[PDB]
Amino acid sequence: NLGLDCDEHSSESRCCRYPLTVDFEAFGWDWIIAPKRYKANYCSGQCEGPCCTPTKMSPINMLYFNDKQQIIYGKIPGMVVDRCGCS
Amino acid sequence: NLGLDCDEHSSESRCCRYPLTVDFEAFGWDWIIAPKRYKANYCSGQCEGPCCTPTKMSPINMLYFNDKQQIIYGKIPGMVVDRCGCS
């Protein structure tokens, strides 16, 4: 398979990956220590039914408080869109 | 500029980003606690300088020992190839 990577304001119409930064403190996800922000990206474009959606995801390593007075470092899956495709 | 994202054995001749897993444990980089391996990717393909090279990079968050008996969590830049292009 083949994926496409675009900038914002590109003229590509096909299903493409675009940049997007997620900001945990902006949503009040207070229990996260780091990172406070990260580039998650997102998918958009014509698939002409099938739609443009993540076909590959990658993890990020996070430092956060849990429910049990612990601080966790852990690899959290499914956090970054690595590729977009029609499905 | 538009980037392409390939699987291994894709048959694409153009400049494209391919998957690649870096394994710190395999190279004995013993000051790194986590992650022991991660998806860095790489760039390969024809550009008809111009050479197929990374054009966007992403960090990873790492846990490691330093020179001063300390354990460090930090955002390490330039660790993941996010986009490949001809330049």
Swiss-Prot record, chains A, B:
Cell compartment(s), UniProt: Secreted
Top-level taxon: Eukaryota
Disulphide-bridged cysteine pairs: 6-16, 15-52, 43-84, 47-86
PTM description: Synthesized as large precursor molecule that undergoes proteolytic cleavage by furin-like proteases. This produces an inactive form consisting of the mature C-terminal portion non-covalently bound to its cleaved N-terminal propeptide. Activation of the mature form requires additional cleavage of the propeptide by a tolloid-like metalloproteinase.
Tissue-by-tissue expression: In the embryo, strong expression is seen in the palatal epithelia, including the medial edge epithelial and midline epithelial seam of the palatal shelves. Less pronounced expression is also seen throughout the palatal shelf and tongue mesenchyme.
Noted disease: Vertebral hypersegmentation and orofacial anomalies: An autosomal dominant disease characterized by supernumerary ribs, supernumerary cervical, thoracic and/or lumbar vertebrae, and orofacial anomalies such as cleft lip with or without cleft palate in most patients.
Protein role: Secreted signal that acts globally to regulate anterior/posterior axial patterning during development. May play critical roles in patterning both mesodermal and neural tissues. It is required for proper vertebral patterning and orofacial development. Signals through activin receptors type-2, ACVR2A and ACVR2B, and activin receptors type-1, ACVR1B, ACVR1C and TGFBR1 leading to the phosphorylation of SMAD2 and SMAD3.
Subunit structure: Homodimer; disulfide-linked. Interacts directly with ACVR2B. Interacts directly with ACVR2A. Interacts with ACVR1B, TGFBR1 and ACVR1C in an ACVR2B-dependent manner. Interacts with FST isoform 2/FS-288.
Family: Belongs to the TGF-beta family.
Protein name in UniProt: Growth/differentiation factor 11
Organism: Homo sapiens
Residues of the full protein shown: 299 to 407 of 407
